[PDB]
């Protein structure tokens, strides 16, 4: 039998390629009473293997071992049975995904599994992708395709970037204008000519039932959805909907849902009214994401100028003994953190949240790789971090050669972040004390959508880079090997082809689906 092509590479795997394996030519019999068989049914059928729910003498034996924890598993494949041990449902999902990526043709060309044993568990507990639904919005049906592929590669976290300057997508019943006004912009930058507007309104939001459906579908695939509501910056859509939430006393105050990309100046005012609005929003977020351990508050790229120009903000600073607008930002984050903690969740924010003082309880999402001291200081102060470095995991960035020259394939910049570059990432900062390595929760790629209007382009930007990230996030650093990874990656392509995924071809860099239509039309 050929060697398994599983990505991420398991931590321990012994394959006896010369021994008799388990033939799949007649499908797999699943124990009908075990709820886990429903997930096995789904995963085997995704890979072209027939299944049947049987009362007696199933082929798969599910066993429980609490020592395997939330995500660890064991696999034992003999000619007689396929045994899967886990400590939780998600460990079983991961065993099943490893199993299907161990399928190879037998002597007669029928699918079979080798005689093999696997014991596996992830290096990092946070293994994420971030979807930006604000710059362009992707429908639930497309998010579900993303979630299916995330489970296959053992990603466990979808960070959902739901509010920004160019659109607010998160349904809040108490403040309907956030979506009816804040969900709509009058135009977008022209594709191929970002410095001009297209004159075409662009709007959308998720309904409450759609939010909950995504959360549930993700959870059934082992994925926790973590919501992000941006503050105090990236707030133009919310402020356009409710102008009293911004710095209304500045010269030239004219909030609007923004039509252009980049950093915008409209920040929330640090007032009691704004804090009550945010508490109301956080309350509804907790109802929509009841199982999320975190609420991401954003915190990036909030220019201080409007606060400098606002007598209201200056008075808040004097009231609270704040010497400058960085301390004002720290104060803002501290007050929102209390709202989140009072609902039993943890705050996470982009690495700008250390400005004016990093809360000792906040979790930091590290993205500005050009400022390595920020992550080092956060770790030294005892804080947990998640690594989303712009040096490696900004999947809006370009890749290696081979892409079409057409404007539809344009990207934000000409930085080439290839899958090879991603594969060489090591998330733990150099010189981190051994006892502080547990504060590095994991890593995640961010897929900003200024230049990604729809799913085929999203797939080109994300695959195969996310497969390299999946291995970085799961596999021990010392087991990574680019040459072997390429072999396994090449063996993933038939599965991705059968789903019509528009990945960037490893061989020549062209789209796998060169005729896919990339459009803003929804
Ligand atoms: C935390 C973060 O990444 N902030 C912005 C982001 O809003 C934008 O979409 C991205 C495009 O690369 O550029 C970053 O500066």
UniProtKB/Swiss-Prot annotation:
GO terms for cellular component: membrane. The active site is at residues 164, 234, 301. CDD domains: GH20_chitobiase-like. Keywords: Carbohydrate metabolism, Glycosidase, Hydrolase, Polysaccharide degradation, Signal. It catalyses: Hydrolysis of terminal non-reducing N-acetyl-D-hexosamine residues in N-acetyl-beta-D-hexosaminides. Its EC number is 3.2.1.52. Substrate binds at residues 135, 300, 367, 394-396, 448-450. Gene3D superfamilies: Chitobiase/beta-hexosaminidase domain 2-like, Glycosidases. GO terms for biological process: glycosaminoglycan metabolic process; polysaccharide catabolic process. Residues 500-522 are annotated as: Disordered. Inhibited strongly by Cu(2+), Zn(2+), Cd(2+) and Ni(2+) ions. No effect on activity with Na(+), Li(+), K(+), Ca(2+), Mg(2+) or Mn(2+) ions. Optimum pH is approximately 7. Stable activity from pH 4.5 to 8.5. Retains more than 30% of activity at pH 9.0. The keyword Hydrolase applies. Pfam families: Glyco_hydro_20 (PF00728), Glyco_hydro_20b (PF02838). Potentially capable of cleaving the specific glycoside linkages in the process of mucin degradation in human intestinal tract. Hydrolyzes chromogenic substrates pNP-beta-GlcNAc with high activity and pNP-beta-GalNAc to a lesser extent, but not pNP-beta-glucose or pNP-beta-galactose. This is Beta-hexosaminidase Amuc_0868.
């Amino acid at each position: 039998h050929m060697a398994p092509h599983t990505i991420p590479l398991p931590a321990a795997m012994r394959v006896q390629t010369g021994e008799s394996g388990f033939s799949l030519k007649n499908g797999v019999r699943l124990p009908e009473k075990n709820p886990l068989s429903r997930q096995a049914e789904r995963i085997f059928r995704d890979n072209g293997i027939n299944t049947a729910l049987v009362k007696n003498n199933a082929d798969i034996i599910f066993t429980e071992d609490a020592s395997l924890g939330r995500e660890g598993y064991r696999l034992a494949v003999t000619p007689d049975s396929i045994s899967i041990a886990s400590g939780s449902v998600n460990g079983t999902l991961y065993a099943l995904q490893s199993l299907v990526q161990s399928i190879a043709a037998d002597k007669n060309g029928a699918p079979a599994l080798p005689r093999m044993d696997v014991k596996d568990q992830p290096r990092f507990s946070w293994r994420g992708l971030m979807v930006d639904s604000c710059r362009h919005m992707m429908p639930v049906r497309d998010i579900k395709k993303v979630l299916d592929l995330m489970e296959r590669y053992k990603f466990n976290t979808l960070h959902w970037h739901l509010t920004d300057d160019q659109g607010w997508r998160l349904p809040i019943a108490k403040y309907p204008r956030l979506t009816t006004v804040g969900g709509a912009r009058a135009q977008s930058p022209v594709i191929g000519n970002r410095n001009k507007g297209d004159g075409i309104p662009y709007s959308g939001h998720y309904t409450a039932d759609e939010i909950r459906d995504v959360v549930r579908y993700a959870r059934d695939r082992g994925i926790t959805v973590i919501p992000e509501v941006e503050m105090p910056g990236h707030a133009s859509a919310a402020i356009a909907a409710y102008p009293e939430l911004g710095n209304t006393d500045i010269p030239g105050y004219e909030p609007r849902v923004q039509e252009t990309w980049g950093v915008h100046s409209y920040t929330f005012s640090p007032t009691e009214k704004t804090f009550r609005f945010l508490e109301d929003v956080i309350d509804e977020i907790c109802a929509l994401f009841p199982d999320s351990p975190y609420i991401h508050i954003g915190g990036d790229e909030a220019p201080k100028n409007q606060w400098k120009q606002s007598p209201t903000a200056q008075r808040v600073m004097k009231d609270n003994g704040l010497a400058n607008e960085h301390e004002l930002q720290s104060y803002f984050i501290r007050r929102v953190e209390k709202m989140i903690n009072n609902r039993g969740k943890r705050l996470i924010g982009w690495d700008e949240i250390q400005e004016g003082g990093l809360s000792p309880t906040a979790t930091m999402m590290v993205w500005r790789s050009q400022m390595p001291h920020i992550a080092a200081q956060a770790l030294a102060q005892g804080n947990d971090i998640v690594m989303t470095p712009n040096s490696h995991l900004y999947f809006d960035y370009d890749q290696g050669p081979g892409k079409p020259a057409a404007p539809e394939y344009e990207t934000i910049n000409n930085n080439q972040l290839t899958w090879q570059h991603v594969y060489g990432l090591e998330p733990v900062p150099q010189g981190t004390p051994r006892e502080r390595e547990k504060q590095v929760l994991g890593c995640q790629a961010n897929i900003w959508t200024e230049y990604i209007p729809n799913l085929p382009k999203w797939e080109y930007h994300v695959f195969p880079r996310a497969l390299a990230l999946a291995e970085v996030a799961w596999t021990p650093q010392e087991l990574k090997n680019e040459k072997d990874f390429r072999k396994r990656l090449d063996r993933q392509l038939p599965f991705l082809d059968a789903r019509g995924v528009n990945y960037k071809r490893p061989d020549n860099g062209a789209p796998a689906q060169p005729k896919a239509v990339i459009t803003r039309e929804r």
